[PDB]
Structure 1
Amino acid sequence: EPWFFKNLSRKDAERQLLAPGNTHGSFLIRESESTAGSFSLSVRDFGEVVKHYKIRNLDNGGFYISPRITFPGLHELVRHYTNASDGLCTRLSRPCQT
């Protein structure tokens, strides 16, 4: 998945998203370096800032950022927030470019 980044800290994710070639809505998902199975979504917004969202785990293996809408997988979460912001700072646009 072009949006999933391996072995990144929060500050690494921030630097990657603030790099030239990214813009409003540029995003990635990473795993916590400290907590196995805990994922987060990082999104570039506009000074120019990166917002982080905790992806919460359902016992059945699904995911949510807001309890209003849950997803059976990260692909479905990304597709949903690519369609509309639905409570995030902005609509997801392009996966983080390296």
Structure 2
Amino acid sequence: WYFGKLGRKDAERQLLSFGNPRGTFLIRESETTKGAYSLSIRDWDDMKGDHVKHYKIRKLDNGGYYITTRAQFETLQQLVQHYSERAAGLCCRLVVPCHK
């Protein structure tokens, strides 16, 4: 998963640079809330067939992270691996390898 500190520019640009399908994701941190991040996946309304969507994430009260309450985790790595099984309430599952 995530290569470093990118999400706004690099992420949105790279995601549309190849045209990578469902499964492509990356994690970027939120500037507006330290300790929070945003999950960047390539999601489109299927007519544009090219877009990038960002999910606003909130920090768990137990010190973990979650996108939904049906999928709460203490580490972000474990979170990636669960969403790598299926979409736990995201438009895309996290099933791609990370190659730049």
TM-score range, shorter chain: 0.7 to 0.9
The two structures have a TM-score, normalised by structure 1, of 0.80
Give the Cα–Cα distance (whole angstroms) in 1 for the partners of residues 96 and 70 of structure 2: 24
Change (3 A) 1:81 1:9: closer
Percent identity between the two aligned chains: 60
2:82 is the counterpart of 1:84: no
| Larger relative contact order (CA 8 Å, sep ≥ 6) | 1
The 5 A counterparts of 1:1-98 are 3-20=1-18, 22-46=20-44, 47-98=49-100
Please give the root-mean-square deviation of Cα atoms over the aligned residues, in Å.
2.0
In structure 2, stretches of 5+ residues that fail to align are none
1:14 CA displacement: 1.1
Number of residue pairs aligned between Structure 1 and Structure 2:
96
Q: C-alpha distance in 1, partners of 2:89/2:57?
A: 14
Which 4+ runs in 1 deviate beyond 6 A?
none
Q: Name structure 1 gaps, 5 residues minimum.
A: none
